[PDB]
Scaffold this active site. Structure first.
Site, PDB file in Angstrom:
ATOM      1  N   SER A 197      16.439  66.976  70.819  1.00 35.13           N
ATOM      2  CA  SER A 197      16.131  65.925  71.816  1.00 35.13           C
ATOM      3  C   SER A 197      14.850  66.301  72.573  1.00 35.13           C
ATOM      4  O   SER A 197      13.810  66.373  71.918  1.00 35.13           O
ATOM      5  CB  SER A 197      17.325  65.654  72.705  1.00 35.13           C
ATOM      6  OG  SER A 197      17.188  64.383  73.320  1.00 35.13           O
ATOM      7  N   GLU A 314      22.764  57.880  66.830  1.00 33.45           N
ATOM      8  CA  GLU A 314      22.073  58.526  67.975  1.00 33.45           C
ATOM      9  C   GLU A 314      22.566  57.910  69.290  1.00 33.45           C
ATOM     10  O   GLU A 314      22.543  58.600  70.320  1.00 33.45           O
ATOM     11  CB  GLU A 314      20.560  58.382  67.844  1.00 33.45           C
ATOM     12  CG  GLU A 314      19.967  59.238  66.751  1.00 33.45           C
ATOM     13  CD  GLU A 314      19.912  60.728  67.037  1.00 33.45           C
ATOM     14  OE1 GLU A 314      20.314  61.132  68.138  1.00 33.45           O
ATOM     15  OE2 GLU A 314      19.442  61.487  66.151  1.00 33.45           O
ATOM     16  N   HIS A 426      24.458  61.658  68.842  1.00 31.65           N
ATOM     17  CA  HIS A 426      23.397  62.517  69.405  1.00 31.65           C
ATOM     18  C   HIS A 426      23.965  63.903  69.709  1.00 31.65           C
ATOM     19  O   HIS A 426      24.958  63.974  70.463  1.00 31.65           O
ATOM     20  CB  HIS A 426      22.842  61.854  70.654  1.00 31.65           C
ATOM     21  CG  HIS A 426      21.616  62.497  71.184  1.00 31.65           C
ATOM     22  ND1 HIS A 426      20.400  62.430  70.513  1.00 31.65           N
ATOM     23  CD2 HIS A 426      21.407  63.172  72.332  1.00 31.65           C
ATOM     24  CE1 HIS A 426      19.494  63.063  71.235  1.00 31.65           C
ATOM     25  NE2 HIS A 426      20.096  63.546  72.353  1.00 31.65           N
TER      26      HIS A 426
HETATM   27 CL   LIG Z   1      17.504  65.477  76.028  1.00 33.17          CL
END
Ligand SMILES: [Cl-]
Ligand SMILES: *[C@@H]1O[C@H](CO[C@@H]2O[C@@H](C)[C@@H](O)[C@@H](O)[C@@H]2O)[C@@H](O[C@@H]2O[C@H](CO)[C@@H](O[C@@H]3O[C@H](CO[C@H]4O[C@H](CO)[C@@H](O)[C@H](O)[C@@H]4O[C@@H]4O[C@H](CO)[C@@H](O)[C@H](O)[C@H]4NC(C)=O)[C@@H](O)[C@H](O[C@H]4O[C@H](CO)[C@@H](O)[C@H](O)[C@@H]4O[C@@H]4O[C@H](CO)[C@@H](O)[C@H](O)[C@H]4NC(C)=O)[C@@H]3O)[C@H](O)[C@H]2NC(C)=O)[C@H](O)[C@H]1NC(C)=O
Ligand SMILES: *[C@@H]1O[C@H](CO[C@@H]2O[C@@H](C)[C@@H](O)[C@@H](O)[C@@H]2O)[C@@H](O[C@@H]2O[C@H](CO)[C@@H](O[C@@H]3O[C@H](CO[C@H]4O[C@H](CO)[C@@H](O)[C@H](O)[C@@H]4O)[C@@H](O)[C@H](O[C@H]4O[C@H](CO)[C@@H](O)[C@H](O)[C@@H]4O)[C@@H]3O)[C@H](O)[C@H]2NC(C)=O)[C@H](O)[C@H]1NC(C)=O
Ligand SMILES: [Cl-]
Ligand SMILES: [Cl-]
Ligand SMILES: [Cl-]
Lengths: 522, 518
Positions: A197, A314, A426
């Site tokens: 990320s 995600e 995610h």
């Molecule tokens: Cl993040």
């Protein structure tokens, strides 16, 4: 057997580590925690580039986890169980090292440098335990820290505060690794940077940065690249004006502002910081001399070999949980969808007229609310993660090897305590990259999950050794070329071509063309 | 046209002065004696450099700094020096900037590293004003610890060594942090130096401690493998300093306390024994021998200029290292014994004397010719072969521009023997536009044009990592064709400089040494 208190050299002095065992191995690990890679960024060193660390006299204790950088608590009940008792401070420029216990100065092992995520406003190295990755793949694992939030990313857009302090700290940590990792048994010529990320955004920013040239041999970008829309900004104006205003500082000059902001104590800085749940990198002119888009589009772009990937869901659960706390997604119906998509268009910085383009592309004639909600989560994941990953992979693959993955494995421990629609959310691949080992927790896993985690750790470590994930006994991972092949990463291995090609056509050609047509009705 | 410019540094403001350069319109701001590190005194002797202290008010930048502690053994050299003192307190740099420039002007930066066998020299010999003015460039002249204070090592934690090299790193970190305030671009820093300054520059090129502190490198008549300036072992400098100091300690912790107790006069007495002193493989600044770092498949040099002169051992070095003039005694009768003695100095077995004789002198009987062949051989061993080897290692990873400088300076031609071509250091006069500490050297019109060409090659390289621009003679990059610039009034290009000598030194002689063994 292996040493209980290993001592290792650094440029600034000796450090004393400790001996750690991982589950189901004769292989033990030496850990060296809280090593300083820069001078504490305090007093006049707040909102300043990192300076070289001070020497020390004795053998420094390397058995204690470092302070995390200043951050806010913006459930997280479980994160504080599976975290050491970490304190918080401006004094946070430290790294942690996990080495196979056999290793010593000159063992020449590949090195993997983990850059944590948390929207450039939260996180710490001490959440991550590299012991299982280090032990299984005969690799040095380095977890770094860097300035977060206002202390990391405040900018005047001028010489008084150019910005990107957090990114300059990451550069300082990678320079330290070049200078010192040989003393721990690492090979400075086989350093791979990896992150998820905002850590992926960070890694991807190093890949385009002239300032990061020669500090790593390979890059791994998990669910994040340098053009992730909310983590990069052309203008410093809003962070400049908001911090100057909230701090109560007299601000006739940037020079006066900087003196006033350096006077604030930690509690005052935490109050100013709490406003920013996310904070972007700027085009600082130093770490990012131009926008990452321009650096990647350049004919003289020379990226390292890279792994780039994303998960198949995600926007499945964790990000909707954080950024849709009222669960408005579950209220989506055909009746409400147009207005929701105009609101979504504004968040994506599109004109509100684009709402109907998003609806035709992702929902079409769909009436079923459950289906509409899944199409909505798909669209958000595509905008934030999948399309940026595919664009960056497209820019890198004409200059250097790209190995692309889509991770598809739903974690066994979460599947029953999440909605049944959630696939690989995610962050779901991070559990397998670290062999289900984190700070004070071993996560429960099936036999199949163990085999898949062994496969992912060997792909990642093979890439750290050779700039190629492949080895005999691992399923083939084709390099990305004009056929645009990618690894479908799941228990049962497969390969796809041209992931989400119709969506990529929509986001990159159709939607910009249709926006240009709106300027014509006006 | 400001007479007393004020500029910002991280540690406080400095007051410079205004200088005009001969017959030309661009004026220059000078900022002299700026500290880049804390004085390396008391517990900071034989220790890495610390960050300099902040100061109140405006620091005087109009006075030349002290030189570092050193010994002299050229009467008229000190006539062309400003009246500077000597001190352990010597970690200062000098800045020459076009007077138009201000914070953010973003000019290219050239950082000069002085030579002197890592035992002598100072920044204040060099005046960057003419280079700065002519080529719109920031010129920084640095200082660094010399001799025992710069290069003492125990080979262990108590004194790893390379203090002088860490000072040069500290000066480049200062340039990254501060040069923007003077109008320099920290992303266009080129390091340049001659002889031990070349060795220094070349050592930065291989150092992980120096990565990102410069964009380009220029190595004039010196590289990191120059035989006498690098050592694998600290043993001799360790034992000689421990013995001469009278410290006589059983352990390096006791030795370090005793050596830090010595005053400046005591340290100058210990220092005088070392006419030359080497860098060690400290494991930090030099993590391995420079040879291994350059031979590595993962060697990542910056773009580089590398070169040498056509008569490196012509006059000045024979004058200093053969004061008794025994080269002038060489005859066919004495040559074999002279070459066995030369073999020992080159760290070859004495059997190699006859290989040197066949290679460089053959059937030659004439003493004058034999003496010229002897000077050729020494220049090749010390300078030319090391430069060609380093250029070979760099050129497969990054652009190398190679030069052989051939211009005999007009002002020295009448004074020196007529056999001397471009002696060691002769190109420095043209790099600095004939401008040095309180002397402008006399030059012909042709020499002015050649100096303008060399200053523009060097400044073009500072701007772009390529010396070339329209109106300068073409300087081809060095690849497998091994082209080099024949740098003289009449421009020309050669290929594979001294290829037969390179074959001799790098293949023939090592093979025959391995045939003496076993
Ligand atoms: Cl993040
Ligand atoms: C942080 O940001 C906020 C918000 O800023 C605004 O929004 C952002 C996004 C940007 O667009 C900014 O450009 C924009 O300003 C700031 O809060 C604002 O502060 C401004 C001052 O810069 C205020 O403008 C003035 O407001 C007063 C009336 O408001 C007072 O009374 C309120 C109670 O009802 C109280 O809550 C307010 O806090 C405020 O109290 C005053 O605060 C200021 C600042 O500390 C202080 O100087 C005053 O002394 C004090 N006043 C009193 C009576 O207590 C209004 O009366 C003002 O009008 C005059 O001033 C104008 C510009 O100077 C001028 O255009 C007017 O015409 C008028 O001028 C006067 O005219 C007569 C002749 O006709 C003459 O005799 C006078 O001498 C002359 N005086 C002057 C000084 O010129 C003025 O409009 C905003 O209202 C306020 N907004 C909000 C929503 O609160 C905050 O300052 C920022 N903080 C920091 C640290 O930067
Ligand atoms: C600096 O180095 C000097 C040279 O040291 C030697 O060379 C170096 C490179 C090493 O190999 C090192 O290991 C060598 O020793 C050094 O000078 C020397 O010092 C040694 C003592 O360690 C002398 O050896 C002894 O000499 C005496 C004879 O007397 C003379 O020395 C004393 C010194 O105090 C003077 O006061 C006198 O007036 C004389 O000048 C011998 O009687 C004695 O033998 C006995 O002791 C040894 C063991 O200690 C036994 O092995 C014997 O069997 C005897 O029981 C020593 O042999 C050495 O002669 C001397 N060399 C020279 C050329 O002067 C100097 O001390 C060093 N400086 C410091 C401060 O360390
Ligand atoms: Cl520190
Ligand atoms: Cl100081
Ligand atoms: Cl020299």
């Amino acid at each position: 057997q292996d040493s209980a208190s290993p001592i290792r050299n650094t440029h600034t002095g000796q450090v004393r580590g400790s001996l750690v065992h991982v589950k189901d191995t004769d292989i033990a690990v030496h850990t060296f925690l809280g090593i300083p890679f820069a001078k504490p960024p305090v007093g006049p060193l707040r909102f300043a580039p990192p300076e070289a660390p001070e020497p020390w006299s004795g053998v420094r204790d390397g058995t204690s986890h470092p302070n995390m950088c200043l951050q806010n608590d913006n459930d997280l009940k479980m994160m504080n169980l599976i975290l050491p008792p970490i304190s918080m401070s401006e004094d946070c420029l430290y790294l942690n090292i996990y080495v196979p216990a056999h290793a010593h100065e000159g063992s020449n092992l590949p090195v993997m440098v983990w850059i944590h995520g948390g929207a450039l406003t939260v996180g710490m190295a001490s959440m991550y335990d590299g012991s299982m990755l280090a032990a299984t793949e005969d690799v040095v694992v380095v977890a770094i820290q860097y300035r977060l939030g206002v202390l990391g990313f405040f900018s005047t857009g001028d010489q008084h505060a150019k910005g990107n302090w957090g990114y300059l700290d990451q550069v300082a940590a990678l320079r330290w690794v070049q200078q010192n990792i040989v003393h721990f048994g690492g090979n400075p010529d086989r350093v791979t940077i990896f992150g998820e990320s905002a850590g992926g955004t960070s890694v991807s920013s190093h890949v385009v940065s002239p300032m990061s040239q020669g500090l790593f041999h390979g890059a791994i970008m998990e669910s994040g690249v340098a053009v992730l829309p909310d983590l990069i900004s052309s203008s410093s104006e809003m962070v400049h004006r908001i911090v100057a205003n909230l701090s109560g500082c007299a601000a006739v000059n940037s020079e006066t502002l900087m003196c006033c902001l350096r006077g604030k104590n930690e509690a005052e800085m935490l109050a100013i910081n709490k406003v920013f749940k996310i904070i972007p990198g700027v085009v600082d002119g130093e770490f990012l001399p131009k926008h990452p888009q321009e650096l990647m589009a350049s004919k003289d772009f020379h990226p390292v070999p890279s792994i780039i990937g994303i998960n198949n869901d995600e926007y499945g659960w964790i990000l909707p949980t954080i950024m849709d706390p009222a669960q408005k997604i579950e209220e989506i119906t055909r009746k409400t969808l147009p207005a929701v998509l105009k609101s979504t268009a504004l968040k994506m910085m599109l004109p509100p007229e684009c709402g109907d383009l998003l609806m035709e592309e992702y929902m079409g004639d769909t009436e079923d609310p459950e289906t509409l909600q899944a199409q909505f989560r798909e669209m958000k994941g595509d905008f934030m993660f999948v399309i940026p990953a595919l664009q960056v992979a497209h820019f890198q693959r004409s200059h250097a090897p790209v190995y692309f993955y889509e991770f598809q494995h739903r974690p066994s421990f979460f599947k029953d305590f999440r909605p049944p629609y959630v696939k690989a959310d995610h962050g779901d691949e991070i559990f397998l990259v670290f062999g289900y080992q984190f700070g004070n927790i071993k996560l429960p896993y099936t036999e199949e999950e163990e085999q898949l985690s062994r496969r992912i750790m060997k792909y990642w470590a093979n890439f750290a050794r050779h700039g190629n994930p492949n080895s005999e006994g691992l399923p083939y991972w084709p390099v990305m070329d004009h056929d645009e092949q990618y690894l479908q990463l799941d228990i049962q291995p497969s390969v796809g071509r041209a992931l989400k090609a119709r969506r990529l056509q929509f986001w990159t050609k159709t939607l910009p063309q249709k926006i240009q047509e709106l300027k014509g009705s006006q």
